[PDB]
Amino acid sequence: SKFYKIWLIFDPRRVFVAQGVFLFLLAAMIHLVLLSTEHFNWFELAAANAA
Amino acid sequence: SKFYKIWLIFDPRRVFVAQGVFLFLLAAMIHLVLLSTEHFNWFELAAANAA
Amino acid sequence: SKFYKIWLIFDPRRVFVAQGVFLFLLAAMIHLVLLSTEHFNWFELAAANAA
Amino acid sequence: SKFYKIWLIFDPRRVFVAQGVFLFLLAAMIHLVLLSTEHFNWFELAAANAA
Amino acid sequence: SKFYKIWLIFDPRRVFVAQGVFLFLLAAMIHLVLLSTEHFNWFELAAANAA
Amino acid sequence: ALLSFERKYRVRGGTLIGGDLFDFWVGPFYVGFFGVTTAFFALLGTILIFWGASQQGTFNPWLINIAPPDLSYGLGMAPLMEGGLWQIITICAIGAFVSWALREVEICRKLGMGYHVPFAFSVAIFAYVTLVVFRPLLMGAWGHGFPYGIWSHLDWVSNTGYAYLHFHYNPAHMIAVTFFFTTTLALALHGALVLSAANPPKGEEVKGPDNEDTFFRDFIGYSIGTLGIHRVGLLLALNAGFWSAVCIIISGPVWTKGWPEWWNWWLEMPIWPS
Amino acid sequence: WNSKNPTDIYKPAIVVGVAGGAVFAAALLVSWGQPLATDSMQTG
Amino acid sequence: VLADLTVENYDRLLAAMRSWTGIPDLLEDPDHYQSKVAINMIQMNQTINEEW
Amino acid sequence: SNSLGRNCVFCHNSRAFYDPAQHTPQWATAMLGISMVQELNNEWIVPIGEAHLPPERLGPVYNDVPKLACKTCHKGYQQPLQGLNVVADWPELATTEGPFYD
Amino acid sequence: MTCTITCWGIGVLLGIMTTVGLMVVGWSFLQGAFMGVLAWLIVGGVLAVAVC
Amino acid sequence: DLSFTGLTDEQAQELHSVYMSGLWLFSAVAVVAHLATFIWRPWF
Amino acid sequence: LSFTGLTDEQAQELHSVYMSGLWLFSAVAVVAHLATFIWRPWF
Amino acid sequence: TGLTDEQAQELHSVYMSGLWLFSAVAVVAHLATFIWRPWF
Amino acid sequence: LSFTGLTDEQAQELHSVYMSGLWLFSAVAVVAHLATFIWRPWF
Amino acid sequence: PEYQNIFTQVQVQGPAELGVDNENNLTEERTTGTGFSQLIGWIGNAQLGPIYLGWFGIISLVTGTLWFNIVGFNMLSQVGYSIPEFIRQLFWLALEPPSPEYGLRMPPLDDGGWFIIASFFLLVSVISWWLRSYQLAEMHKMGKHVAWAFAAAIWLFLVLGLFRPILMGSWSEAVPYGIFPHLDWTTAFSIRYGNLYYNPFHALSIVFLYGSVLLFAMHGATILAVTRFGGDRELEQIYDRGTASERAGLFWRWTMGFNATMEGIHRWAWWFAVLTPITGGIGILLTGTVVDNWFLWAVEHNFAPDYTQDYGYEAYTTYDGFLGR
Numbered sequence A, B, C, D, E: 001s002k003f004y005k006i007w008l009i010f011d012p013r014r015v016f017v018a019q020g021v022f023l024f025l026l027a028a029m030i031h032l033v034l035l036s037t038e039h040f041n042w043f044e045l046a047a048a049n050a051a
Numbered sequence F: 001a002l003l004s005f006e007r008k009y010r011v012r013g014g015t016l017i018g019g020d021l022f023d024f025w026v027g028p029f030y031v032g033f034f035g036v037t038t039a040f041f042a043l044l045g046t047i048l049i050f051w052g053a054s055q056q057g058t059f060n061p062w063l064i065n066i067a068p069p070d071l072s073y074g075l076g077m078a079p080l081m082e083g084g085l086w087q088i089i090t091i092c093a094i095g096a097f098v099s100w101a102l103r104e105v106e107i108c109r110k111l112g113m114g115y116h117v118p119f120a121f122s123v124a125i126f127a128y129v130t131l132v133v134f135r136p137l138l139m140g141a142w143g144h145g146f147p148y149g150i151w152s153h154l155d156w157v158s159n160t161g162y163a164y165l166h167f168h169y170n171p172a173h174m175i176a177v178t179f180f181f182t183t184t185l186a187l188a189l190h191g192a193l194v195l196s197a198a199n200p201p202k203g204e205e206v207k208g209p210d211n212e213d214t215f216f217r218d219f220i221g222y223s224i225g226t227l228g229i230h231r232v233g234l235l236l237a238l239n240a241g242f243w244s245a246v247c248i249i250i251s252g253p254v255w256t257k258g259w260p261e262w263w264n265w266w267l268e269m270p271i272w273p274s
Numbered sequence G: 001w002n003s004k005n006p007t008d009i010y011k012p013a014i015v016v017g018v019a020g021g022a023v024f025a026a027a028l029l030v031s032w033g034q035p036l037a038t039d040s041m042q043t044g
Numbered sequence H: 001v002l003a004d005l006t007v008e009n010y011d012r013l014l015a016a017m018r019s020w021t022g023i024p025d026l027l028e029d030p031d032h033y034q035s036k037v038a039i040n041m042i043q044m045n046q047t048i049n050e051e052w
Numbered sequence I: 001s002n003s004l005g006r007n008c009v010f011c012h013n014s015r016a017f018y019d020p021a022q023h024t025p026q027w028a029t030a031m032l033g034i035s036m037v038q039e040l041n042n043e044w045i046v047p048i049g050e051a052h053l054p055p056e057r058l059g060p061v062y063n064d065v066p067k068l069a070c071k072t073c074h075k076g077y078q079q080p081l082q083g084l085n086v087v088a089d090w091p092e093l094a095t096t097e098g099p100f101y102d
Numbered sequence J: 001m002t003c004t005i006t007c008w009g010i011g012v013l014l015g016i017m018t019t020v021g022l023m024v025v026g027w028s029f030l031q032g033a034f035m036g037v038l039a040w041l042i043v044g045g046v047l048a049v050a051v052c
Numbered sequence K: 001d002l003s004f005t006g007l008t009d010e011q012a013q014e015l016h017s018v019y020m021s022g023l024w025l026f027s028a029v030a031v032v033a034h035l036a037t038f039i040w041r042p043w044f
Numbered sequence L, N: 001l002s003f004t005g006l007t008d009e010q011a012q013e014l015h016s017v018y019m020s021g022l023w024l025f026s027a028v029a030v031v032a033h034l035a036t037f038i039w040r041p042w043f
Numbered sequence M: 001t002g003l004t005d006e007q008a009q010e011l012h013s014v015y016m017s018g019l020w021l022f023s024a025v026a027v028v029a030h031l032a033t034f035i036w037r038p039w040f
Numbered sequence O: 001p002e003y004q005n006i007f008t009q010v011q012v013q014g015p016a017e018l019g020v021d022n023e024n025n026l027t028e029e030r031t032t033g034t035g036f037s038q039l040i041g042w043i044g045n046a047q048l049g050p051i052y053l054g055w056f057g058i059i060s061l062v063t064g065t066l067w068f069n070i071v072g073f074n075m076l077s078q079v080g081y082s083i084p085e086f087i088r089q090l091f092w093l094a095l096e097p098p099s100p101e102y103g104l105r106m107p108p109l110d111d112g113g114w115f116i117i118a119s120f121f122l123l124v125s126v127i128s129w130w131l132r133s134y135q136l137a138e139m140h141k142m143g144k145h146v147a148w149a150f151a152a153a154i155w156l157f158l159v160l161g162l163f164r165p166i167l168m169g170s171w172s173e174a175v176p177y178g179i180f181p182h183l184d185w186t187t188a189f190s191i192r193y194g195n196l197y198y199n200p201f202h203a204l205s206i207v208f209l210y211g212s213v214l215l216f217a218m219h220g221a222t223i224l225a226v227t228r229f230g231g232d233r234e235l236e237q238i239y240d241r242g243t244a245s246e247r248a249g250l251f252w253r254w255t256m257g258f259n260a261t262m263e264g265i266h267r268w269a270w271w272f273a274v275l276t277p278i279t280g281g282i283g284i285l286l287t288g289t290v291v292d293n294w295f296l297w298a299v300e301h302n303f304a305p306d307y308t309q310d311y312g313y314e315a316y317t318t319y320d321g322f323l324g325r
């Protein structure tokens, strides 16, 4: 409940830009990992399901 | 709710350019991803659909 | 255990950034080695379970 | 015996940080050596244990 | 004997750090040499006894 | 002997190891702890070359050839006359080059100047190190290093070049070669500007930095400046040494097929119509 | 009590992390060993 | 060219050539161009192993 | 080199591509291959293709018969099928004067 | 700076993302890397100028 | 009352209101486009 | 106390918005993960 | 330029609170992983 | 308020002209896409 | 660590420097259009100053474009005006020299005729640029070292495409106008005439090419090492030697026993770079016109190494052993 003091250390401008870049890069990386697998690849699953 | 304070940290001119570049590239990348797949490629489907 | 005397000789900006990067790199590394193994790869295991 | 006088020449501030890096690198090194082995790779032993 | 006068010659702080690095580097190098062999590889030796 | 201004610079101190035990000058050369090791390694390496030349049967500097061992010996030591002498000379050469770079550190530390020169030499050492130990280590045999001959080591370059069927197509070779032809381009023009400004036509005043600054402004529309040319100049030559190190460390450890075949990624891109 | 004199506290850590890194790489290159061995055949 | 072979050798070789050349109907119709090419090419294969 | 999967120094010494004294024994085998390929293409492959091959099997530009070369047999390997003995059990294709099973 | 370097850092990260993204959908590492290099130069260059 | 961009609280509040309206409209078009695509070729 | 100039009360107000944003991002992530688990479980 | 005694008192308390919170999830995650797929 | 030193009244004037051009550019595109769909449909 | 003067950490921009002037009236032909690039200003000067456009400059620029366009138009027409194929094969297409059957006569336009015309404009363009360098130095009242150094580069340029083809009696000896094709020509030239490694002038040119990069790494590092003493202002160090010239000299005197002056370093710099194409031009001019085989020339003159080991792979390993089976 005392975690708010983290902003006294880190500039909000620097962390927010870093967080936004990291969050999308992490989200894109996990999405690409799923697309590599043959099971969790919704693009190929739709092709198999339709056929 | 009070998310409007993000503009006190982010310069509106800086974020708008970055968001505009990000959105088009994300839209272009996803469109190119669908063309890579053999099931959602609307260009190749039209050739197959037209027989 | 108090052990608060250590923070006197440390810059909170430097250690927090270094530790934050270190934890994510460590977490990513353990997640990557688990995926490398054929037994703990939950993506490959999920495909086997379904089939 | 009378080893407490090492801090009379070594700086405890620098020694504590130096050994922390050394200890982690030692732990990371030793752990990664076990993974290379065919007998102590606990990830592979779990696969053999299941089968 | 009378070897205690080496500290009247060598800086105790300077020799100890050189001694510490040399002793660990020697220990790490010797341990790796045994791993490079076949007879004195306790990791490979343990696997042989298992079979 | 000294120079007309050398006396005020020959001060005690600036050593990395050995202190004043070796801190003296022999002739114009500075002798340090690493000047002692340079003398030992360079002399031992040079003598072993001539000892190997003696048993080779020829002392002709063109025909002297101390070759590495066969690829069958792997990374182990070979008989001294079956390629083992090359391994010792390599150790002596590496010890001499590192000592030479470290000796330069002591010299420039005693003169209170930057360590740019020993760092720049270290790139040349790295280019040699990646040729004689790093690449052989990756390829698993000491026989992949170049032999120690004036013309014998040209055959190694020719054979290693054709070991990938056309070595000009190496992408890192193209970058590295482009840096050599441009480093000599920068050297020719930079040396010309200072000479042209300091040596005008007879009977006319010498020129300052402005005149050469505005000359390539009039010539090529841009002048990088007096300080900038040395900054880009070191970078051009360091990149020449670094990329040359890259082009040979990827030839065999990273790429085993022909180098023209590497460019197949560009030719058969999906965007190109059939 | 404490000491308030200046001290470059990360100076010895960096060199340890570099010397240890060389040992770390060497141990991996001995345990696993040469990920791409690229063996060569002598034809001359 | 291959009529002098024994029955078991002719069947063994003819079955192999169909698998080797990926033609399940090879040497079935003599007037077929593939069969006529194969007959000449049988001689060429024998020439490679003998002359060269 | 591409057909054999090898490089230029497999059969040549780079400093002298002409010198017979600086050639590996594989150079002599390759020299025999050049004669064999010319014999196969000129006298065996082209004559049979020009009389039986359909138009769909011909070339795009000159409508010429397909020819063979080094890569037709090796297909990127130092020896075809990496030196597999493919003629020991096939005496019929080993000679032109009747199989010799012995 | 503190903004041009960040934009350059954003571009190289996007270049790596486009490099692996093309490998997942096929392509090749070298073909993907070139587009990643192209994305790093174009997007990084555009950002370094458009936003400062 | 911190502001690293020089905008007051009133100015930022009005800017967000326009940006929010210039986010739902972009998302509403995206929702309609996604709905039409799913009817055409569903992916799950 | 502060390192970047923000006062104690300013950070408290900033943290409350950040946590509310973090919870909203995590709320949809939980919903997104829950829907994916039903569609294709990985356990 | 350094921290006071009072400044480090609250910083350590927050850090420990984050330490327990991060570790508590990690312990729960490891137990869940062990039940799902043990490695011993 | 105005990062470009441009008044609010001027911005509304500029946007009204810009939107008029945007719709005209989009109106041609709608007709262009309608002609293409009739000639060669992609659905 | 200490500030290594590699990137300037603060840039100052003032009024654009239009350049010096004298009775030669340089300002008449200057563009008077300046721009400042802060990106290039990190490593060098940031002003993209005005360029003096004379008649040698314009003729060189115009004729160089004609050579560039004629090569480009041919390359575009070589792929049938297919822009995607032109871009794809850009590094592979070229304007090939005439066939050897035509000798020094004018060949057909499709068989190297356009090559000669494009080469004619390139020759005029290169010589005109050299005249601009000579004229600019004369109008700036400085030495002609820039023009003289350029003439050394032109010497190899003239030998490669103009002098040697004339001496060899065939326009086919010229270098194709392509990215990869002039690399193929470079490799084929070495193979055709033996081994160009054993050409002494090719070896000599490599000595000065290696020396040029070696010196200009040494000079660049030494000046940056003494730039804390104003060593980058070399001209003022020539007219009035400061401690920058003394320490730079004493660093190399204590390292290798001898040094140079702040002016004498550029004489070493100028001559090593200038000797790179001068020896190369001589080596190329002696190739084919005199020798036609360099390794045999090396064997004849007894500096080609001799090897006693066997040559086949069977002498060192087996095919199965290499395959690990």
Ligand code: BCL
Residues within 6 Å of the ligand: F097, F123, F124, F125, F127, F128, F131, F156, F157, F158, F159, F160, F161, F162, F166, F167, F168, F173, F176, F177, F180, F240, F241, F243, F244, F245, F247, F248, O186, O187
């Ligand atoms: C068939 C031949 C292939 C070919 C195959 C190779 C091969 C093979 C190699 C190169 C490498 C190089 N090639 Mg190539 N290359 C070809 C055609 C070319 C052409 C051209 C115009 O055609 C050019 C310009 C180049 C250019 C080059 C550079 C990229 C590089 C040269 C070595 C280097 O940089 O120094 C680096 C070397 C050093 C800096 C030496 C270090 C010196 C030491 C530290 C000090 C020496 C001290 C010594 C003891 C002397 C002291 C004694 C006295 C006291 C003074 N190649 C042809 C196509 N090329 C070489 C390379 O990159 O090496 C890294 C390499 O291995």
Ligand code: BCL
Residues within 6 Å of the ligand: F157, F181, F184, O126, O153, O154, O156, O157, O160, O185, O186, O187, O189, O190, O195, O196, O197, O201, O202, O205, O206, O207, O209, O276, O277, O278, O279, O280, O281, O282, O283, O284
């Ligand atoms: C298989 C390859 C052969 C080979 C074949 C050749 C051939 C062939 C040649 C060389 C030559 C050179 N070789 Mg060799 N060479 C090989 C191996 C090597 C190796 C190595 C490590 O293996 C190296 C370092 C070298 C090095 C060199 C250089 C020393 C030398 C070029 C001099 C020069 O500066 O050119 C730079 C000069 C020019 C580029 C021409 C001048 C350009 C003109 C003046 C500029 C006009 C610009 C134009 C208009 C475009 C302007 C556009 C602008 C954008 C506006 N060779 C092997 C043996 N080598 C050259 C030589 O022999 O020199 C004696 C040469 O002709």
Ligand SMILES: CC[C@H]1c2cc3[nH]c4c(c3C)C(=O)[C@H](C(=O)OC)c4c3nc(cc4[nH]c(cc(n2)[C@@H]1C)c(C(C)=O)c4C)[C@@H](C)[C@@H]3CCC(=O)OC/C=C(\C)CCC[C@H](C)CCC[C@H](C)CCCC(C)C
Residues within 6 Å of the ligand: F038, F041, F042, F043, F044, F045, F046, F089, F092, F093, F096, F097, F100, F117, F118, F120, F121, F123, F124, F147, F148, F149, F150, F151, F153, F237, F238, F240, F241, O210, O213, O214, O217, O218, O221, O255, O256
């Ligand atoms: C940035 C890369 C460039 C570069 C830079 C560079 N070289 C440098 C420096 C710098 C900045 C120095 O400060 C230093 C110097 O003082 O030069 C005068 C040096 C130097 N680089 C030199 C030469 C050199 N530079 C070369 C190239 C380059 N160096 C690159 C172009 C080459 C090439 C291309 O081959 C050579 C030959 C020396 C003049 C000098 C290093 C002096 C030295 O090492 O002295 C100690 C050693 C001896 C006196 C003799 C040692 C003998 C050995 C024990 C045995 C022989 C070993 C060797 C492998 C022999 C092989 C012979 C055959 C290959 C023929």
Ligand SMILES: CC[C@H]1c2cc3[nH]c4c(c3C)C(=O)[C@H](C(=O)OC)c4c3nc(cc4[nH]c(cc(n2)[C@@H]1C)c(C(C)=O)c4C)[C@@H](C)[C@@H]3CCC(=O)OC/C=C(\C)CCC[C@H](C)CCC[C@H](C)CCCC(C)C
Residues within 6 Å of the ligand: F180, F181, F182, F183, F184, F185, F186, F188, F189, F220, O060, O061, O064, O065, O068, O069, O125, O126, O129, O133, O146, O147, O149, O150, O152, O153, O273, O274, O276, O277
């Ligand atoms: C030998 C030692 C080094 C050297 C020296 C050297 N080169 C030199 C000099 C010196 C001393 C000069 O003074 C001179 C110079 O001015 O340098 C800035 C030069 C020079 N050598 C150059 C490059 C160069 N140097 C090379 C090599 C070297 N020369 C070594 C590195 C090489 C190689 C590797 O062969 C090249 C290619 C030039 C940059 C320059 C003089 C060339 C020149 O300007 O020629 C006149 C031609 C033009 C102005 C136009 C050329 C063609 C254009 C590209 C066409 C226009 C295109 C554009 C898109 C327009 C399109 C229009 C249409 C669409 C209508």
Ligand SMILES: COC(C)(C)C(=O)/C=C/C(C)=C/C=C/C(C)=C/C=C/C(C)=C/C=C/C=C(C)/C=C/C=C(\C)CC/C=C(/C)CCC=C(C)C
Residues within 6 Å of the ligand: N025, N028, N031, N032, N034, N035, N036, N038, N039
């Ligand atoms: C029996 O036969 C039947 C069956 C009948 C038959 O024949 C079937 C035929 C059939 C169906 C025809 C199918 C063809 C069709 C449909 C043709 C596509 C038609 C197209 C493509 C229309 C082009 C018009 C586009 C323009 C001309 C844009 C101009 C763009 C302008 C210039 C804007 C750019 C300028 C700016 C300034 C904006 C930039 C702004 C700033 C810089 C601020």
Ligand SMILES: COC(C)(C)C(=O)/C=C/C(C)=C/C=C/C(C)=C/C=C/C(C)=C/C=C/C=C(C)/C=C/C=C(\C)CC/C=C(\C)CCC=C(C)C
Residues within 6 Å of the ligand: A027, A028, A031, A032, B019, B023, B026, B029, B030, B033, J021, K011, K014, K015, K016, K018, K019, K021, K022, K023, K024, K026, N001
């Ligand atoms: C390969 O793998 C795959 C799987 C493909 C992969 O990677 C998956 C990728 C994934 C999932 C990416 C995650 C996507 C995300 C997170 C999307 C973010 C997108 C967002 C957030 C959309 C904002 C749009 C808001 C606008 C654009 C409003 C328009 C604003 C207008 C223009 C008004 C502006 C004007 C003003 C404000 C006026 C100024 C006011 C005053 C002056 C008062």
Ligand SMILES: COC(C)(C)C(=O)/C=C/C(C)=C/C=C/C(C)=C/C=C/C(C)=C/C=C/C=C(C)/C=C/C=C(\C)CC/C=C(\C)CCC=C(C)C
Residues within 6 Å of the ligand: A019, A026, A029, A030, A033, B002, B003, B005, B006, B008, B009, C024, C027, C028, C031, C032, K002, L010, L013, L014, L015, L017, L018, L020, L021, L022, L025
């Ligand atoms: C390969 O291996 C695999 C297995 C794939 C792998 O890697 C596994 C993944 C691994 C290990 C990643 C580990 C994940 C981690 C660590 C998750 C970090 C993610 C986090 C923490 C989420 C933050 C969310 C923050 C937001 C979204 C806030 C929103 C903020 C809003 C917008 C408010 C902003 C506005 C203000 C504050 C107003 C300002 C106030 C004043 C001015 C008063």
Ligand SMILES: COC(C)(C)C(=O)/C=C/C(C)=C/C=C/C(C)=C/C=C/C(C)=C/C=C/C=C(C)/C=C/C=C(\C)CC/C=C(\C)CCC=C(C)C
Residues within 6 Å of the ligand: A002, A003, A004, A005, A006, A007, A008, A009, C016, C019, C023, C026, C029, C030, C033, D027, D028, D031, D032, L001, M007, M010, M011, M013, M014, M015, M016, M017, M018, M019, M022
């Ligand atoms: C295959 O490889 C294998 C085999 C796997 C391998 O390598 C084995 C791995 C090996 C051996 C590594 C062993 C790992 C080790 C040892 C890592 C210890 C882990 C630790 C320590 C966890 C830290 C957690 C820190 C947090 C999460 C704090 C949270 C607190 C945050 C920061 C908030 C604090 C902020 C404030 C209170 C506000 C500021 C206050 C004021 C301004 C007053």
Ligand SMILES: COC(C)(C)C(=O)/C=C/C(C)=C/C=C/C(C)=C/C=C/C(C)=C/C=C/C=C(C)/C=C/C=C(\C)CC/C=C(\C)CCC=C(C)C
Residues within 6 Å of the ligand: B024, B027, B028, B031, B032, B035, N013, N014, N015, N017, N018, N019, N020, N021, N022, N025
């Ligand atoms: C398969 O997919 C692939 C292919 C891979 C793919 O990438 C798919 C493509 C993708 C996803 C791109 C997404 C497209 C998007 C987003 C379309 C953006 C397009 C937009 C926004 C249209 C703007 C039109 C604006 C005009 C044209 C205004 C005209 C302006 C007029 C002329 C007025 C100018 C001003 C004046 C006259 C004076 C004003 C001044 C005063 C009054 C003072």
Ligand SMILES: COC(C)(C)C(=O)/C=C/C(C)=C/C=C/C(C)=C/C=C/C(C)=C/C=C\C=C(C)\C=C\C=C(/C)CC/C=C(/C)CCC=C(C)C
Residues within 6 Å of the ligand: E002, E003, E004, E005, E006, E007, E008, E009
């Ligand atoms: C290449 O060929 C092959 C065959 C391969 C080869 O290998 C050939 C090798 C060849 C030829 C090497 C030949 C070796 C030679 C010549 C080495 C002699 C070795 C020597 C000389 C070393 C003496 C030992 C010194 C000590 C160990 C002192 C101990 C000092 C103690 C510690 C006392 C100091 C303590 C004090 C307290 C001081 C008092 C202080 C005060 C009073 C203040």
Ligand SMILES: COC(C)(C)C(=O)/C=C/C(C)=C/C=C/C(C)=C/C=C/C(C)=C\C=C\C=C(C)\C=C\C=C(\C)CC/C=C(\C)CCC=C(C)C
Residues within 6 Å of the ligand: C016, C017, C019, C020, L043, M018, M022, M025, M026, M028, M029, M030, M032, M033, M035, M036
């Ligand atoms: C019927 O059959 C059933 C039973 C279904 C069956 O099949 C068996 C399946 C079974 C049992 C499932 C087994 C569960 C598994 C494998 C789930 C592992 C998951 C685990 C264990 C927990 C993850 C939670 C991760 C978070 C959410 C972390 C939160 C951390 C966040 C991201 C904070 C980190 C960041 C900071 C603290 C910032 C610090 C800041 C600075 C340092 C500046």
Ligand SMILES: COC(C)(C)C(=O)\C=C/C(C)=C/C=C/C(C)=C/C=C/C(C)=C/C=C\C=C(C)\C=C\C=C(\C)CC/C=C(/C)CCC=C(C)C
Residues within 6 Å of the ligand: O068, O069, O070, O071, O072, O073, O075, O076, O116, O117, O119, O120, O122, O123, O157, O158, O160, O161, O162, O174, O175, O176, O177, O178, O179, O182
């Ligand atoms: C977009 O725009 C369009 C336009 C579409 C386009 O395509 C742009 C053009 C494009 C892309 C072409 C790109 C050009 C390329 C890659 C060419 C590289 C060029 C290279 C590597 C040069 C090799 C060295 C050649 C020598 C060494 C010459 C020396 C010969 C000289 C000249 C001596 C003179 C010779 C003569 C014969 C004299 C003749 C005179 C009389 C007979 C009087």
Ligand SMILES: [Fe+3]
Residues within 6 Å of the ligand: F190, F194, F230, O219, O223, O234
């Ligand atoms: Fe200089």
